[PDB]
Amino acid sequence: RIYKGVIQAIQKSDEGHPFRAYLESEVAISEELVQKYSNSALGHVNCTIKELRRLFLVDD
């Protein structure tokens, strides 16, 4: 069920338009926030950052 949505996604943005980059950037930049949750978890901060980045993840 659309499990390979990594090579296709990067493709679309590559097909649709280049301007998408600057867009996907903010999306890929957020992917890091999810990584900060691990270091933020130190004090349930992940839910604080996630809620800021994702706005739903809230830790997980």
mmCIF file with all atom_site columns, C-alpha atoms in Angstrom:
data_model
loop_
_atom_site.group_PDB
_atom_site.id
_atom_site.type_symbol
_atom_site.label_atom_id
_atom_site.label_alt_id
_atom_site.label_comp_id
_atom_site.label_asym_id
_atom_site.label_entity_id
_atom_site.label_seq_id
_atom_site.pdbx_PDB_ins_code
_atom_site.Cartn_x
_atom_site.Cartn_y
_atom_site.Cartn_z
_atom_site.occupancy
_atom_site.B_iso_or_equiv
_atom_site.pdbx_formal_charge
_atom_site.auth_seq_id
_atom_site.auth_comp_id
_atom_site.auth_asym_id
_atom_site.auth_atom_id
_atom_site.pdbx_PDB_model_num
ATOM 1  C CA . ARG A 1 1  ? 0.000  0.000  0.000   1.00 0.00 ? 1  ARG A CA 1
ATOM 2  C CA . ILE A 1 2  ? 2.165  2.799  -1.340  1.00 0.00 ? 2  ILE A CA 1
ATOM 3  C CA . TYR A 1 3  ? 5.118  1.719  0.768   1.00 0.00 ? 3  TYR A CA 1
ATOM 4  C CA . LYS A 1 4  ? 7.697  3.175  -1.588  1.00 0.00 ? 4  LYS A CA 1
ATOM 5  C CA . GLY A 1 5  ? 6.554  6.757  -1.150  1.00 0.00 ? 5  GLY A CA 1
ATOM 6  C CA . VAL A 1 6  ? 10.109 7.980  -0.715  1.00 0.00 ? 6  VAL A CA 1
ATOM 7  C CA . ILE A 1 7  ? 11.446 7.679  -4.243  1.00 0.00 ? 7  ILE A CA 1
ATOM 8  C CA . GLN A 1 8  ? 8.086  8.657  -5.686  1.00 0.00 ? 8  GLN A CA 1
ATOM 9  C CA . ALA A 1 9  ? 7.602  11.657 -3.429  1.00 0.00 ? 9  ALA A CA 1
ATOM 10 C CA . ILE A 1 10 ? 11.049 13.027 -4.178  1.00 0.00 ? 10 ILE A CA 1
ATOM 11 C CA . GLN A 1 11 ? 10.098 12.403 -7.787  1.00 0.00 ? 11 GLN A CA 1
ATOM 12 C CA . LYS A 1 12 ? 6.809  14.275 -7.809  1.00 0.00 ? 12 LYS A CA 1
ATOM 13 C CA . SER A 1 13 ? 8.427  17.357 -6.321  1.00 0.00 ? 13 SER A CA 1
ATOM 14 C CA . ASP A 1 14 ? 10.997 16.790 -9.041  1.00 0.00 ? 14 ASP A CA 1
ATOM 15 C CA . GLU A 1 15 ? 8.304  16.443 -11.678 1.00 0.00 ? 15 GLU A CA 1
ATOM 16 C CA . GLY A 1 16 ? 5.600  18.838 -10.550 1.00 0.00 ? 16 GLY A CA 1
ATOM 17 C CA . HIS A 1 17 ? 7.993  21.755 -10.254 1.00 0.00 ? 17 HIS A CA 1
ATOM 18 C CA . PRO A 1 18 ? 11.394 22.760 -8.859  1.00 0.00 ? 18 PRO A CA 1
ATOM 19 C CA . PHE A 1 19 ? 9.903  25.507 -6.723  1.00 0.00 ? 19 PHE A CA 1
ATOM 20 C CA . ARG A 1 20 ? 8.578  22.619 -4.669  1.00 0.00 ? 20 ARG A CA 1
ATOM 21 C CA . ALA A 1 21 ? 12.077 22.237 -3.275  1.00 0.00 ? 21 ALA A CA 1
ATOM 22 C CA . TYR A 1 22 ? 11.915 25.340 -1.113  1.00 0.00 ? 22 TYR A CA 1
ATOM 23 C CA . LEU A 1 23 ? 8.590  23.867 -0.060  1.00 0.00 ? 23 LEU A CA 1
ATOM 24 C CA . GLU A 1 24 ? 9.721  20.323 0.641   1.00 0.00 ? 24 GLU A CA 1
ATOM 25 C CA . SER A 1 25 ? 12.669 21.900 2.413   1.00 0.00 ? 25 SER A CA 1
ATOM 26 C CA . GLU A 1 26 ? 10.509 23.157 5.255   1.00 0.00 ? 26 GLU A CA 1
ATOM 27 C CA . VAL A 1 27 ? 9.013  19.681 5.237   1.00 0.00 ? 27 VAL A CA 1
ATOM 28 C CA . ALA A 1 28 ? 12.379 17.952 5.359   1.00 0.00 ? 28 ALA A CA 1
ATOM 29 C CA . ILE A 1 29 ? 13.543 20.513 7.893   1.00 0.00 ? 29 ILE A CA 1
ATOM 30 C CA . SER A 1 30 ? 10.726 19.435 10.179  1.00 0.00 ? 30 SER A CA 1
ATOM 31 C CA . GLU A 1 31 ? 11.796 15.818 9.859   1.00 0.00 ? 31 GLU A CA 1
ATOM 32 C CA . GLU A 1 32 ? 14.638 16.871 12.127  1.00 0.00 ? 32 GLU A CA 1
ATOM 33 C CA . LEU A 1 33 ? 12.284 18.143 14.806  1.00 0.00 ? 33 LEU A CA 1
ATOM 34 C CA . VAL A 1 34 ? 11.018 14.592 15.138  1.00 0.00 ? 34 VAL A CA 1
ATOM 35 C CA . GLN A 1 35 ? 14.643 13.763 15.851  1.00 0.00 ? 35 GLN A CA 1
ATOM 36 C CA . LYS A 1 36 ? 14.941 16.475 18.473  1.00 0.00 ? 36 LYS A CA 1
ATOM 37 C CA . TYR A 1 37 ? 12.080 14.828 20.323  1.00 0.00 ? 37 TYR A CA 1
ATOM 38 C CA . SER A 1 38 ? 14.540 12.155 21.386  1.00 0.00 ? 38 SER A CA 1
ATOM 39 C CA . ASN A 1 39 ? 16.808 14.741 22.965  1.00 0.00 ? 39 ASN A CA 1
ATOM 40 C CA . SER A 1 40 ? 13.807 16.816 23.969  1.00 0.00 ? 40 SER A CA 1
ATOM 41 C CA . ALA A 1 41 ? 12.131 13.824 25.571  1.00 0.00 ? 41 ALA A CA 1
ATOM 42 C CA . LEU A 1 42 ? 14.621 14.566 28.325  1.00 0.00 ? 42 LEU A CA 1
ATOM 43 C CA . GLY A 1 43 ? 11.702 16.513 29.746  1.00 0.00 ? 43 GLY A CA 1
ATOM 44 C CA . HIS A 1 44 ? 8.576  15.744 27.753  1.00 0.00 ? 44 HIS A CA 1
ATOM 45 C CA . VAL A 1 45 ? 9.883  18.488 25.497  1.00 0.00 ? 45 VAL A CA 1
ATOM 46 C CA . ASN A 1 46 ? 9.323  16.362 22.417  1.00 0.00 ? 46 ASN A CA 1
ATOM 47 C CA . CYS A 1 47 ? 5.605  16.880 22.899  1.00 0.00 ? 47 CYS A CA 1
ATOM 48 C CA . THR A 1 48 ? 6.461  20.552 23.238  1.00 0.00 ? 48 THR A CA 1
ATOM 49 C CA . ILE A 1 49 ? 8.516  20.700 20.063  1.00 0.00 ? 49 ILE A CA 1
ATOM 50 C CA . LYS A 1 50 ? 6.480  18.157 18.136  1.00 0.00 ? 50 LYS A CA 1
ATOM 51 C CA . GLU A 1 51 ? 3.376  20.172 18.929  1.00 0.00 ? 51 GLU A CA 1
ATOM 52 C CA . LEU A 1 52 ? 5.270  23.071 17.402  1.00 0.00 ? 52 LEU A CA 1
ATOM 53 C CA . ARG A 1 53 ? 6.629  21.209 14.400  1.00 0.00 ? 53 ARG A CA 1
ATOM 54 C CA . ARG A 1 54 ? 4.039  18.537 13.706  1.00 0.00 ? 54 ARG A CA 1
ATOM 55 C CA . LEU A 1 55 ? 1.311  19.993 15.888  1.00 0.00 ? 55 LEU A CA 1
ATOM 56 C CA . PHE A 1 56 ? -0.047 16.504 16.451  1.00 0.00 ? 56 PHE A CA 1
ATOM 57 C CA . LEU A 1 57 ? 2.811  14.067 16.925  1.00 0.00 ? 57 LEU A CA 1
ATOM 58 C CA . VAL A 1 58 ? 2.974  15.339 20.486  1.00 0.00 ? 58 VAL A CA 1
ATOM 59 C CA . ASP A 1 59 ? 5.932  13.182 21.448  1.00 0.00 ? 59 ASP A CA 1
ATOM 60 C CA . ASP A 1 60 ? 4.509  10.365 19.357  1.00 0.00 ? 60 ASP A CA 1
#
